[PDB]
């Protein structure tokens, strides 16, 4: 009879819910809804819980979908959990607590994957110590076109080098590079001044963009 729901959502504000109820046994049946009490605007991370004794009924919560009934007072008098049993699922699909006789298409049965398999073929590493650390990247008008194929593409060597002013990946997510497989790799190495880097991007037009090297 001292219900206390505590949640901490980064949508960063805490929420507390409470309701006092008459009680004669232990956690009884009933849909006494907890009215939110405080919404303290704290923003630091929380991962523990403790109760100060001067009984203790900890229950963890999970993402679920519910169907709630409101009476003619703005009070929740009944609820249905849409993942408990098929009857509750069909109640949620019909949006009615009373379900008439019949057959109702509710959800879809799927067989989840048991194991993950990768079969990438074998050993030879791709030349990246040549395209980088070459001591001469030639010019923007005469830029080196290096073809990379038939090898293990290890992009960790790129991260191993100096911090990058602009490491921008357009078609591919930078973090997911090592997972993907590619048909052919082209390395285009040159040296340009700092202020013209922003103009070297797909879909962007400019003097340096069109007269030196246009992606």
């Amino acid at each position: 009879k001292n219900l206390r729901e505590f949640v901490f959502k980064n949508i960063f504000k805490i929420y507390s819910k409470h309701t006092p109820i008459n009680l004669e046994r232990d956690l009884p049946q009933g849909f006494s809804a907890l009215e939110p009490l405080v919404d303290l605007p704290i923003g630091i991370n929380i991962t523990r819980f403790q109760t100060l004794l001067a009984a203790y009924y900890v229950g963890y919560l999970q993402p679920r979908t519910f169907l709630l009934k409101y009476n003619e007072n703005g009070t929740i008098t009944d609820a249905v959990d849409c993942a408990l049993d098929p009857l509750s699922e069909t109640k949620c699909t019909l949006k009615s607590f009373t379900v008439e006789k019949g057959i109702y298409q509710t959800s879809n049965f799927r067989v989840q994957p048991t194991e993950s398999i990768v079969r990438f073929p074998i050993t030879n590493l791709c030349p990246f110590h040549e395209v980088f650390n070459a001591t001469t990247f030639a010019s923007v008008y005469a830029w080196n076109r290096k073809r990379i194929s038939n090898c293990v593409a290890d992009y960790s060597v790129i991260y191993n080098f100096a911090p990058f002013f602009a490491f921008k990946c357009y078609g591919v997510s930078p973090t997911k590079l090592n997972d993907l497989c590619f048909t052919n790799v082209y390395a285009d190495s040159f040296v340009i001044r700092g202020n013209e880097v922003s103009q070297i991007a797909p879909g962007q037009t400019g003097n340096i963009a069109d007269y030196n090297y246009k992606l």
Binding site: T90, T114, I117, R119
Partner: protein, 163 residues
């Protein structure tokens, strides 16, 4: 040109995720009699789906079938009558997932009865479910009462009254 990812051993007849040379999907790999010409491996069907693929390390043709799936339907009486329900997995054999195998699918939670009644809750190919005395029973629906007309070469039937 692939990236660093240590290959995992191949499995058979299991719903697994597969990543073959960047081809990412989920399915069941089975031995295939398809005779791929040496060219390549990305086999495809009329449905524009990667039905088959040849394993790169060992050159064998493996057919990829989609993992078993279907729709679930809930056969229930009125909520006031009872809270018991039956579940029909449509198009799915009972081996995949009070278990009875109908042509519509696998029906769990209902007991099959040989005797035939009129249809109450449709299920599928001639099977109907009903809440009878206190369980859900599935039966082959009865078209109607069997009546034989006493046909003779010289016999007629004439009504004597009306309604």
């Amino acid at each position: 040109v692939c990236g660093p990812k240590k290959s995992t051993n191949l499995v058979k007849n299991k719903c697994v995720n597969f990543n073959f040379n960047g081809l990412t999907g989920t399915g069941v790999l089975t031995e295939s009699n398809k005779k791929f010409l040496p060219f390549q491996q990305f086999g495809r069907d009329i449905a524009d789906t990667t039905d088959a693929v040849r394993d790169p390390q060992t050159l064998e043709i493996l057919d990829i079938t989609p993992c078993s799936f279907g729709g679930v339907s809930v056969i229930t009486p009125g909520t006031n009558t009872s809270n018991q329900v039956a579940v029909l997995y449509q198009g799915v054999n009972c081996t995949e997932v009070n278990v009875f195998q109908t042509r519509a699918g696998c029906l769990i939670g209902a007991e099959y009865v040989n005797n035939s009644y009129e249809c109450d809750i449709p299920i599928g190919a001639g099977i109907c479910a009903s809440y009878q005395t206190q369980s859900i029973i599935a039966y082959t629906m009865s078209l109607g009462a069997e009546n034989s007309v006493a046909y003779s070469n010289n016999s007629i039937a004439i009504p004597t009254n009306f309604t």
